[PDB]
Structures are given as C-alpha cells and as structure tokens.
Design a protein around this nucleic acid. Sequence first.
RNA 1: CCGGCGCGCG
DNA 2: TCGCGTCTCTCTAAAATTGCAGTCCCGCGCGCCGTAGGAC
DNA 3: GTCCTAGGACTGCAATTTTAGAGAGACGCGA
Lengths: 233, 1040, 49, 611, 21
Amino acid sequence: SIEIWYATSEYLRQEMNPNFRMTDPFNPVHMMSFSGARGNASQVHQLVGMRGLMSDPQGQMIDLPIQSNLREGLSLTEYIISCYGARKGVVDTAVRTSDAGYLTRRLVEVVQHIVVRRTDCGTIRGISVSPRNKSRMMSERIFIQTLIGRVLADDIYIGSRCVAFRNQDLGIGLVNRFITFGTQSISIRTPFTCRSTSWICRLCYGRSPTHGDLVELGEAVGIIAGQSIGEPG
Amino acid sequence: GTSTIPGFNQIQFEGFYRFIDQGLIEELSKFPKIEDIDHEIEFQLFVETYQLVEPLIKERDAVYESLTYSSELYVSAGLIWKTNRNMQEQRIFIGNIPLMNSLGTFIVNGIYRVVINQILQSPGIYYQSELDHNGISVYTGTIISDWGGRLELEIDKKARIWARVSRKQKISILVLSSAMGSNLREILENVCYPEIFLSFLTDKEKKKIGSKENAILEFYQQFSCVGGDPIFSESLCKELQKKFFHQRCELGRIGRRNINWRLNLNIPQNNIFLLPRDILAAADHLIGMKFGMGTLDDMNHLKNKRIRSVADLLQDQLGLALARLENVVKGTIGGAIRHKLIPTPQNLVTSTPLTTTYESFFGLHPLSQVLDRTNPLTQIVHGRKLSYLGPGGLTGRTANFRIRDIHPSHYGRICPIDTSEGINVGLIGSLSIHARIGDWGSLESPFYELVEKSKKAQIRMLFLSPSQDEYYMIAAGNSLALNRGIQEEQVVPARYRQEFLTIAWEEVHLRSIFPFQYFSIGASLIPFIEHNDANRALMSSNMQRQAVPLSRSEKCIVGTGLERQVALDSGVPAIAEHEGKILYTDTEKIILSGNENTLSIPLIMYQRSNKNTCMHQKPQVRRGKCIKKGQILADGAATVGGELALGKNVLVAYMPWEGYNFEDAVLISECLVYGDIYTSFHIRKYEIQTHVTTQGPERITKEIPHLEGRLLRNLDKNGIVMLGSWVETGDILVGKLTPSKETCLKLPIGGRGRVIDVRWVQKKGGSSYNPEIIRVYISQKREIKVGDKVAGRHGNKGIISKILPRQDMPYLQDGRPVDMVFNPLGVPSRMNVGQIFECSLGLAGSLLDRHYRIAPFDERYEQEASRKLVFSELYEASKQTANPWVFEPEYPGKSRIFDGRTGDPFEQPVIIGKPYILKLIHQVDDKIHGRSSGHYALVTQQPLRGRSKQGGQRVGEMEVWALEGFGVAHILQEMLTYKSDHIRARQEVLGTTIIGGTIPKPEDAPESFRLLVRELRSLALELNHFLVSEKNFQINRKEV
Amino acid sequence: RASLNTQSFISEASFQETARVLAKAALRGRIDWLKGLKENVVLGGVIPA
Amino acid sequence: MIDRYKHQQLRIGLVSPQQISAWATGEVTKPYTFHYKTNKPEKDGLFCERIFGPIKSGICACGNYRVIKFCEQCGVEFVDSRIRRYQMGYIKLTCPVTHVWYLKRLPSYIANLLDKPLKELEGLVYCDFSFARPITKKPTFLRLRGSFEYEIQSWKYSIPLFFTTQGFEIFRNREISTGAGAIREQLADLDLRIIIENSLVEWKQLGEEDRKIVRRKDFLVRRMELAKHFIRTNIEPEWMVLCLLPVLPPELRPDINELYRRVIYRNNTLTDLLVMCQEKLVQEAVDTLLDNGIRGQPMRDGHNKVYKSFSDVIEGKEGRFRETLLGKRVDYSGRSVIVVGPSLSLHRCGLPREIAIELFQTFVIRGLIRQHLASNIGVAKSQIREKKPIVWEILQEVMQGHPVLLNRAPTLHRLGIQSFQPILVEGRTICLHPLVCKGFNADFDGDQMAVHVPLSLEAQAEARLLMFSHMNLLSPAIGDPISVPTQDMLIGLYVLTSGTRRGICANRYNPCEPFFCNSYDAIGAYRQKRINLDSPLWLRWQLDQRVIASKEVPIEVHYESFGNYHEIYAHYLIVRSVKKETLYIYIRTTVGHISFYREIEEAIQGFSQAC
Amino acid sequence: WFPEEPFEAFKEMRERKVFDV
RNA sequence: CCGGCGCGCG
DNA sequence: TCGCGTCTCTCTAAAATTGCAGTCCCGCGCGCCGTAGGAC
DNA sequence: GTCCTAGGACTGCAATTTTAGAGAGACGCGA
Ligand SMILES: [Mg+2]
Ligand SMILES: [Zn+2]
C-alpha cells in the first residue's frame, strides 16, 4: 500500500510539467513556477496532483495515502493525516533557528580575528590540484569553480612555453586551457598554505568574493567566512 | 452535547458548579479541630453549617470601581472552654470566594480573569525501557501518585532492583518492602522468580530485613544518605511519612483506577493508597516484560493524562487557604490563652487567609490569565486552552521532543491544528468543538454506535475516553456506495489501534458524524478549509483572533454556520432571560415585560476593552415583538443579527498591479477610506495616582506654574481635563504638583483624540488620606491607512502599501472599480485554494441576495462538491442578473477587466469576487518610533528600551558582525561610544551638530567598559589598559 | 574548543565560560594585545580592519 | 612600507590587599543602606557619602554647597557625583576568607599548589578540622602531621595549661591552625622553585617505571606549570585567600546590597566575639557574594529564590560581556513598518516625517538657527515641537546628501544592513525598494526595520562609499548577484520574451507577417493596436549577426539565376548576392523581444549620456 | 585518499608536493 | 529605569 | 625445630560508573505584579 | 491599614566506587 501509492504520486509529479508544456504552456500555474518566479514543482503537485504519503512522528509512514489534491479537497481522514506534516514544520522551525544561530556564533567566533594584513607572506607551498584520477572521471564543473580566483604557487608549462606564471590569478580562460591540454598538476595558494593562523595575505586568499579583483588589505575575511556558512543554516 | 454543539463555556460553567457543590465541603473537612498544648481550649468548625451569600457588589460595580466579584463564606464554629465547660457557637467569617461569570470569567480588582486547563501525566504505573551506553536494554516501571511523586523501579546490569527516589538516593526493593513489614518469607512466594530476589541477599541486609525496625532505619539511611545510625522514633516515621509516604504513596481515586487496570488487579475502588501488593505485583511484570510478555506504556497517550479545570485549581487553593487559616488560629488561640481571656470565636479567625490566597492566585498564577477582549472570538477561545506548562508541568526547555507531536488519541479531543507559535509550540493546545471533560480528568468526544439487531440502544451517541478509543473501529466515511453485492461489504477508511485501515462496514463499531468534531473554534470558522493547506489553517486561526471590531459591522456572505454559535456563547449580544413582549427600545436601554415581570436591560455604549478596542451595543428588536427566553434582544460589537461579524465584503481582484502588491503588499481604493468601510474606534486609558510623600501628599490643581494656558485650556477648576475635549500630543490631562515639582499627567506621543470618560474616585481606606485615582479615556477614530494589516480567513495576510482613486483602480465589465487588488502569486506558494472558492461564491451571493453557511468537508457527498456549489451559484447569479461576465463558460470564475488608467482590457481574465477581509490590530500609529537622544539607563548609561519609554534601537552582535564585514570601522565606533554610553562624548556630539563643527574621536572608554572593570574589581581582579608609545616605548596607563 | 585557546582572554571570556577563563587568566597576569576584532569592540575602540 | 605600529594591551591579575586599600583610600563598617525616615545615606554604611562621594554633586551630608575639597563636619568631598560610579570601598575582614573561584572550582588551584586532595581542604575550610604544621619557615617541636579530624586531647587541655595562655597563643599559629588562615599561611611560605624541582623529579620517577599512573603525572605537569607562572609574574599565591573585600560603587548597585550586608552582618558579629561557626558564616557570605551555585545547594533569600552573585552577572548570555559590551542600544535611531515602493531608485529609501524629524533634530536646529529663523536652541526646539511649516523645508534640505542605515531584525549576513539616501514620504511607513528585499530577506506582511543616522563625516563617508546598494550587487558567499528581479518582475519578463505560438498552436491546418524598417516602427504599431505582443513580425537588421539561435544551416535557400540568393533560417532571413557585396538581414521576432533589447540598450545609452 | 602504507604515503606526499627531501 | 511570570509579532 | 600454605586483612594500580559545568537565533510590541512581617 | 526595619539532550570529564591484584604478619594445624 505504501509503495503503490508512492509510485502513483511520483508519476503524477513527473507528467505534470510535460502536460503543462504541451497542452497549456500559458497556464498561470505553469508560468508562476516554470519562469522561476514563485513556487516549485513540489508545491504545484500538492495542488494539482496528490499529496502522497505522510509520516507519523516516530518516523514510520502512515498506511493510508492522501490521493486527493488541494483543488479537489481533502477528506476528513486525509486532512487529519496532513496535519502530521504541518506540526513538524512549525516544530522543526523552532530548532532550525536555535541551532543555526548557535552554530553561526561559534563559526564567527573561531575566525573573527582573521584579517588580510599582508600582500604576500612569502610561502612556497602550494596545494596540488589534479584533473585526472584513475579512480573516477572528474566532473569538469567542480574543477572550475574551485580554481577560479586562486593564485598559482608555481609556473605552468606546455612544452617549452610558459602559459601561466607564479603569483598569477587563475582566470576562467587559463583553467579551460589547462583542461584543453594535458596539464595534470596545478599548484595554487589557498588559506591552507599561508604562513600564519592569525592573519592571511592577499595572494593566499585570492580574488575578492564581491569586488572582482584581488582581495584588499584590511578586509575582515574571517567574519565574512563565518557569516557565509552560517547564513543558509 | 449528544445532539447539538455544546456551549463553548460549558466546561468552565460545569467545573465551577462542581467546586461549589463538592469542592467546598470536601475542603472544609480536613480542617483540624484546633486544640492548645494544654488541651484547655478546643476550636472546631461545623462544616455542615457552611453557607455562601450573594455578593453585595453588583458584577458591573465590581469592574467599574476596580473591585473583586466574590461571595462571603459564613461557616459556624464552636469554641470549648473546658475551664468554664460552656459552649459558644457563632456565625464566624472565613473569607470571600470569587464567583465565576456566566461567560466563565472571574473579576479581581476590576480585571477579568480566566483560568485555563492544564495537562499532566495521570497517576498510575508506567513501563519504559531506555538503552544504556552499550545498547543493553534497561526496563523501568514508575509509580506516579496524586501529587506527581515518582517512584522509579529499575533493573540494573546485575538484575538488582533498586527503588530509585532521587538522582543519587538508591534503595533496594527488599529493604523498601521490609520497611513496611513485608516479611522476607512472603516476598518470595508471591513472585514467579523467588531466586532473583534471594540472589541479592547479602548477610548484612538479611539481619536488617529480619526485624521490621532495622529495615526502617536502613531505609532511612539509604534514603537520606546521612552518616550515622538513626534511632527509631515516632517522630522519625512521621518525618519520613510527610516526606515519603505523603508525597509518594497516595495514589488517589484516579491512581488506584489505573493501577487496577495496568497491573490487572481486582482491588476495591475506595482504596486510595498504594497497597504493598502493587509494588510486588509491579516487579512481576517488570521482570516478566523483559522476556517478551506485554507492551511498553505509551507516555504521550492521552489515556495517561488528566485535565485540571477551574474546579481543581480553585479547590486546591482552598486547601492552601484553610491550612493558612489554622496557622492564624494557632497563633491567635495561643496569644489569647496567655492573657487568660475568653475570646469570641469570631475574633479567633480573620478573613485574610481565604481572601488573600485567592487575591494572589489570580494575580500570580500562570494558569490565571487576563481575558482577551479584542473581539467576541477571543473571549471564548481563551477559556478553552490546554497547557502542558504551569506548576507541575514541563517547561519549554524541559519539554521532550516526542511531545509537541500529534498523537492518535488526540482525535476529537485536542485540535491537531491549533497551537502556539514560538518556543511554546505543541505545548499549548485547544479543545475541540464537541470535546467534553469526563469524571476522571479525561477528554471525551461523542461517537455514533452501530449495533446488531437485538439491542435496545436508546441513545446511540456515547462519549469515548482515549483509553477505550483505541479498541473501537471508528469510520469517517459514508455509506453511499453499492455494487452487485450488498452494502455491508463495501469498504471504508477506519481507525483502529492508532492506525488507519480500510475495512467493510459490517466490521465498523462507531461512526464520526459531527462536522466540527475534530476542530477548535478558530479552525471551524474557515469556509472551504479542506482546500487550504493545514499549515495556513494554524496561521488563519491566529489572525481571526487579531481582527478589530469595525465602527459598522456586517455579516459574511460565505460562512460555516458556526458564527451564530460564537455570537450566542460570547455574551456580547443581549439574550432574553424571560419571555414576554418588547415595550421600549433606545440606545441606553431595552425594556422587556413578561408574565407580570418587567425588566430593564442596559446597553453598553462605547466602552473600552483590555486591548483598547471599543465595545458597543445596538438594539435588534422593536416595540411590540414577542420574545422567547433565550432569544436575542440586541447586537453588540462585531455582531450582526446574532452572528460573529469581524470583517467586510469588498470587491477584490487577484492580479499584479505595477509592483504595489509585491510580495504581500495590498493595493486598495479610496472608496474604502472615505466610505469608512474599515474605520474602527480605539480607546486608551490614562491613570494617575495620588501618593503621600515625606514632604506631603500630592495635590491636584488647575493652577500649574511654568505652563502655558494653551496647554491647560482643556482643564476644569479641579485640575482635570474636561469631558469632551480634543486633546493633543503634549497636552495636559491631570495637573498634579509634588512638593513643588510638576508631576502632572500629559498625553503621550500620537495619543491625540477626544476625551470621552473621566472618573474622579477616592478609594476609602483606614488612613487620614485616601488614594485618589483618575482615569481618562480617549477615543480615536482610525480609518484604514497605508501600513495597516488586512487578512482573510485563509491565512492570506497583507500590508496596505498604496491607496488609489476610484478612477485609477481596475474595473469590471459592469463598470464598477474593485476595492482591493491581491497578488495572485501568493496562492501557489501558500497553497490556500479555499480563498478562491470564497471570493467567487461571495460575488454570487451578493448578486443573488444570498448568504451561505457551509459545513467543512463537503466532498463527503460527492467529488468536487465545492466546485459544483460555486460554479452553479455563479451561473445562477449571472443568469438572473443578466451579467454574463459573472460566469464565463470559457474560464469560470475569471473575467476580463479593464485598466482604470487607459481603459484597455488586461490581457488575461482575472479571478474577481467579493471575499470577507478583516482589519487586524497590528497597524502603524502603534509601531512607528523615533529618537534623537534623551533618557539613559542608570547603571549601563545606555539609551532606554521600548517605544513607550522613548528608547533607542539595539545594535546587537549580529549587527556588529555585518558592520565588521563591510569594514566600516567608524560607523561601528559611533554606535559603541557616543551614541550609546560615552557620557562625555554624547554631550559634545549634541553641541557640535548644532554648530556643525566636526565630531572628534572619543579616545576614552565608554561607561559599559568602566562598569565591567568595577565588577571585576569586586572579584579581587584588576584590569588595566596600557598604551605603549611606538616612539619612545613609554607605557601609559589609560584611565579606567 | 579552538575558540577557547586563542591569544586573547577578552575574546574567550565574552564567548563562553567567563568565570573559568577569567580565573585562569588573572592567576597568571595574562596580557591581551588587542590584535583581534572583538577585543576592540569590548573597549569601544576602532577595530583593526 | 613601514606599518603604523600600535602597541596597546590590557591584562588581568589577581589583586593584593594593598591594592584594595589603595582603591578604597574608606572602609565600609556598617550594614546600613539608608535612613528609614529621611532616605539619606547612613554614615559608614553601604551608601556612605564620605566613603563613596557626594550625591547631588557639590553638596555634603549636612547640606552645604560649593561651586564645582573636603567638608569639616561630615568630611564629604566637593566633587561631581560621577565619583559614586567609580570610587570603591573595602570591608576589613577579621579573618581571611578564601576566594571561591580558586578553591571550589575544578580543578582547584589552591589544592594543586598545596598538593592535597580537595576534600581535605574543603573539610579544613568548612568543617571543624585543624591542620598540623601549617608553616615551615619557623621551627616547631611536635610530630603532628596531616590534618587530624578529631581535636587532640592533649592540645586541648594539657599543653595550654602547661604553656599558659599568652606565650601559647604567641606560638599557637605555628603547629596547629584551621580554616582559611592556615591555607593562607601555607601559601605565603611556599617555595615555588622547590615545588618545581620536586614535581619534576617525581614525574621522572613515575616515567622511569595505566590510568592513574598517568593521571598522577598530569597533576605533576599541571603543578609545575602552575608553579612556574607565579615566579615570572607579580602575582602572589596567597592572594587567592582574601584579607580585604572590595565594595562595588553605590551607583552601580542602586540583591548585591543584601549580600554586602550579610558580610558586614557576620564580620561585625565576629569582631565582637574577639567562634569557629561565625568564622565559617563570614566565609559563606563572601562565597555567596562572589559566586553562588558552585557549592551544591546555592543560598536562597526569604522568597526561596537563588541569589545572584558577581559571577552570575558577568557570565551567561545576559551577562556583562555578551549583553552590555558586544551589543548596545543607540541614539538617533528609529523604527517603523516597511512598505514597498516600486518608483524608488535603487539607492533611495522613504522616511516618515516623524522618524526623520526625530533622527535629524540637531541638524534641523542648525538649519533653523543658521538662516536666522530661530533666536536660540530653545526657540528652535519649540518651533520643531509646533510642527511649523518651515521646519519641513529645513528638514528636507538637510536630509539631502546625508545617508541612513536600514536594518532588518535577523541580520544573517552583512547585506542585512544597507545604506540609502532618505527622502520624505507621506504616512508613517518606511518606503523600501523592491530589489533589495532579498538581501534583507524582507517581505511586506508585517516586517519592520530600524534606521540609523551616521553623524561624523567619517561615518557618512563610510556609509556613502561602502554600504550603498549599487556597489553591493554581489553576495560575498559565492559571488552571485543579490539584486536580481524576482516574482512579479520575473513573470513580466518571461511573458514579454515568450515568443510566437508556433506549429500546430499557430495554424489549424498545415501551411501546405508585417515587415518593419526599424524597431521603433514595430513598437509604434504595437501602441496603435496594429499588432499583439507575441504576433510574429520581420525586423530589418542593420547591425552584425548577434541573435542567439540554434547553430543550424538554412532551412531553404532560394537561389535566383540573376545571382541573388535568399537563405531562410529558423529565426532570420539573409539576402546575399554573387555580383555585389550587399548583405541584408531580417530577424523574425516579436514586440516583446524588441522591447526587452531596447530597454537594456536604452538603459546603457542613457547612463552613458548622463555622464 | 593517501594510502595507508607508510612508504606509499611518502611517495604520495612527494607526488602531491606535500613534502620532499 | 530592577528582575521574574504570562501573552503575543516578524 | 622450625617450615608451610595460608586467615585475615592490606594497600594500591586500573578501570567503571557518576555527579557537576557548560551551552542551547535575533530583533520588536503590550499587559500585570511586585516591596515582605509583626505586636500595635 | 501601616512606618519603619531586619523535571531535557548531548558532550566532556574528573570523582567516587568499586574489582582486582598481589601480598604479608601472626597462626592453628601439623610434620
Ligand atoms: Mg514578513
Ligand atoms: Zn599567505
């Protein structure tokens, strides 16, 4: 009973969009979500498909499906069952905030003193980044977004020609050139390579997260790091 | 409540009546016959002579002049002077018992109070098992008494049973069993495993067990953890009995009932004490359940709970009241004996014990709360709340995470939707419409019984307690299904053993047939609630409690049929108490005469609530009309024709309009403003008190020095504002002089209005000076404005952000402009489709001159029942009124409307209608705050907190982090030194900015750091701030 | 734990276990050189960032 | 570059009784707070005016006055009442009392430095235990070692009778002692270097030989680490037992006064006797004053409520550090409900008249006085209170160029507070731009914001050049744009750029459009209702091929025998010739795509021309 | 992952330029 | 102008 | 004439529970109630 | 009337509470 009604509920959600795209492209519900404005496919499924299955507080699923959507109108039994998820959302709100707020305070606390105070600490170490690993075909998307804005710790060569110099910001053009050719090793300067745990330099940090260029002296990157992680909690 | 919806205050009404009948007598007993040490003088009460006399003050008078509505207690006492062998019996005075209003609320000091119900674990035996660090299962049985005393029976790693009492005090079963005298021989025979108990018998315990007293002393040693050997004495047992037997061994009537069930015991009901067999019987199951025999006890089950009404709370305080009286008498009899006098029984007893402990119960107890009188809906729902908090109950931090969840035993008893928002979520409940409190503190809901042919079954509606709720197969479906078989084999959804099934009708025992069975009052006022997501149902219930009564009220076109129930049970309208004829009607009174009994019913005219909302009544009958007892005579505020009327029916469109309904903003028309559609009266109260100082009492006079005649222009000769004067911000209300500094009462910011009531009243007391109190009531007519909050009954809330002229609003194909424009993007994310149903049907009803009262879950009759109702009524309105735009066959419910600025139609058809929209208390003129500078705290020297105190805004640590993220180090220092607490630099900033001559850095420490240094000095710690010059390396000590 | 082993006792005292931090630091004449952002916030001075 | 060196430090240290005296010099001797009748500061009491300073600055306890040193009768200074916030006092304890932080907290510092189990010291300080051989730097003649719980029978009668009283008491506190005095004597005569050497040698002996064989080592490492720090600092280990008790200034305690009374209540009782029980009562009074709740059951008041000590008031979320110092309430700040304004610029906000006049009050006063419309400050403030029509002109003038800071309540990142240029709007609500709501996480269903005014030129420059919204278009978390159109604007753009109906959704039957010279002609035809928003049309293109389309070859090429050929793609038509180099381009599009492209192009061109 | 074998780990550190002679 | 308790809003 | 397992403790090394210490989003609004006790 | 007036959930961790481990001075039995 659980799995037959979960498969039925999930099949309605899959066919909801092609039904909208082929037969009613300008349907208001479709446009309000397909354009990315307000609402996702899950919430529209609650309105035009079926609410599916709920779960009792102790993890287990209820052996009775909600086979009606909000337009049709839930039965008295279905409405009571749907109140299980309503109680969870309000209760889980009271713990998502009190925990993430505590987590954010500790995150800001540990790195509050980290400020860009030097132009170059003078380090020679560099974290090695490799595109090819014989255990998995690397996804080029991850290989790019991590490397953008990093400062090279060593020169990169293609044959007898230098294509990227030490202490040079890694643009997206260089990364694609590295991927296009067989460059197996990239050495970058990261916060792990700075010669200090009380401050960081401009080169070991990299490009500014908002200002486009290299990070500027006197920037409180530690608090920005703490806020950036705790904010989506 | 077998065939009708019961009165919403019937639980309060019946509880208080139970207290009067049995609570007084059961508590006037247990009052000791007070005897002196010499036994010469014996004082006793004759409880059978107890009486209550009707209060001397009228209920209107009690609240008018800040009194308490209570009745006198006049039991009789007999004092025995064995010296003279003469008896004297007099009607002595015990105290005042507060009386509950017919609405279910008390009055103390002129303040309406409500006593809410409490939920806590029912007495009995509870079986639980918790995993240890290594995952080894550890079973546990816990005795719960009538006062919350928990006696924990535990099995350890070595299978040794310990009767744990505290976190450290550990006592074995054998010592505890032999403490009461259970001989070691009989303990073995009555259990299935004599070997287990015998294996733990060390030679030291056996000797103490062999004699009754040695077990008692050893039990005392382990329970008290006191070094040394105690001596057996009568006082030791009494000291132990009060601490241990009085709190951990009296089960009560309810506690015995459960123990007889859970431990399967045939013990008589009258035994309200924990029999020694129960402990030995419990150990049988505890060890026996370890081997797969039985099931664990569900602690969140409602069958393991009890509900304490006003009957239990008022009776308990009487237990404290009379115990407080005996200590008064004991001091009084001892005092008069030492003077060898004969005191009259009246003088041995004062009224302070009863009166004060009830005066301080409503004032201080958390379960006693001020009645919320915003609207008729708030008056009744406040008294029906269930709370796990309060004394004897879990706190929010204490609350378990498995609690706050919905349990299957709640169905029909506790509303699954209504709960409080915030840290107290899931801990404040609400009773269902048909819920009833049983005779064991359990909640009951009515179910319809289906029985065989050979059964009388005079009444098939039986109320079901949660304990017996599981063992019935209860169906909620209908019998409108037939195939080539017979009807009894058709399948329907049902509940059984806390799960949902699908079984045939012939296996169904009970049916749930009431429409409002599972909901509270708030959720039962939402039409088409089955099309709204349950998350918004909780929000919608809260918003209806914030609706402001409007200066003019009208009924909703679409409702649920519970509005008439709410109006009747709120007491806001006038209800006849006697049949007869109407003879005279006007604003101030209604005169009704019937059966030689002529009555006069006054009408409330522009009175104030606790929430600054106006109360007003208008007649609903005409002269010459025959009236039945219990029929309506007049309509109150937010009540029309005997129904709850919290809002207005306005023309509404659902479309985006140039970003002025972005997110949740609402665009309205000027017609709602100059038409006074959402105009409400708001009345504030300003009190001033006269006190006796060392220099002399405060004086009230019109003549005030250093004040202009313009400010004092509205005062009379006595020095008080004149009745019916338009005051202004900064104007004077009560002129008072304190020897003489001006300590007058002035009108605060934004309080401009019309003075409507003045009350110059003296509180008569035993002093040469009596405290004079003045109360000024100021009415404020508030039309709807930008920033006000409006909401519908489907969780659709919004702020007014724009007001347009009627020629700019979009208009329909009949040329009428709409009144509100709502963003259509708010429906899909909020998932409240019931508002689309209501607006379309509200439009149809207005054209057809119809109102609709629809019970929820109408799809139990047929599929798409709400769609058929709305579409067919839309077409009927379209056809009868010749308005083809009202129902469009191409797109029912939607119509093409025109832009009021261009006259061109909008491209897509727009869903339009006439829904019911409310105006909420949350509005501007009560939230806009500003501050330049002013008063600071005495210790921290920081600006005050609060809009009423002209305080400033707080820049917390998270706001400091943001300023540090920007790197704005000089904005941060401003908000840390000379805008908050740097006393010297605050005064210089005030000076430079008025001359415009540049602000320098403070360079000194603020008063918050110097405050910290002194506190650290108080812990013998010195904190010095040193500056080392980078030029010559000279160390400079900063002044701190 | 890392936030309780810093070079400033003002940052530790204002984070957690104030009495434990201050008792240990005041016993050894601990010196805080105010090199961090939160240290200067307590004193009301300009942060070094 | 040479760094602008700044060497600033602060240090805490355990204080000395001499420093306590220098703080107070001034001893509080009586527990009286105020007169019951006159409510005047009782002399020598907790609020004594001679000890702490003059209430009502410049007056004595008698009532004399002088212009803002010591009085003769009452001996009260002639200074400001500021001193009552800073001047300390002290309580001269008859017996030394140990500091609770250094005895009862775990691990105990006193216990580790003296090297005795904690229970032994606790029994010595609280119970009636006497310690044998408290000091070593003075000779003894007895063989009593450890801390004998039972009183020595000989030492009670025999030795005092043989050694009489005077000389016996003279040498009494050198072989047997009890309480915190014995602990202080043990701490005073400690040789720290000997402690270090003994600990090191015992550690080596343990090592040269497995739970408590290690735990004893960790004690030795802890003890020699503890012993080293006393040598290099100026702290003395005997300062962990208090001889004087500093008293908080009265203006900081306008609960604490109750605990100060009990210390005086039990210390003044003890000096009357000069007995063991009263010594303990003084010690417990200091412990409750300093730190309640560590000794198991914390002392309560008459209402069965736990007292609040200095440790409680300095620690916790509501303590001094986390509530008074890390966050402050500020002046020149306001608050109101926020409503949406779609006509606002991205760098502007709307302020209510009341909030603006409160926040900019001093600037309005300066504007009034500067143009001779107000005689003085008082007249200007009176004019402001009267809501004169000229107050608003000056307010509107002074608000130009002066930024403000907006802030929503849950500031989760730095974009939770931003800077805007305020303008005067009617009503009582704050007008907020719609594109900055995502950064604030704000919607218009009841949310409110706080407003702050930078005062100094440095703060105004910081707000204008660092915190304005037009320079904060990217989020620091990942670098994504934060001010992106959402919801209604996104739906409008999606409808605008949703092109023609195509295929079976355009014609009922299988097919076996206007041509515009420029986009302005197409838009004008759309205004005159000649064409719809999504009706197809051909637009003559006189720029390079810059239309995003599928990289596909022409559907059909119409080659003429004269040389010209027409290449027909899915979205454009290209006319080429072999005789000439001419090349004409026609784009098949709608009015919506033209409108979107023209909107962005005109925005760029207008911004360029405006500069 | 650096391999659990100590000499393989040393070779990995040499190849990943974590540490060298 | 101080703290607890209760009720709310975002 | 001692010698021998060993009766009865004997003192400490090594885990094994066990009782504290500490912590647990932010920012607003409103109301009520304190401040107690005893021989006059 | 009163005017002075004296009870969660989890983690971390050192503190009791054993458990054991050997081990020895005087010894009743005994060779
Ligand atoms: Mg909001
Ligand atoms: Zn670096």
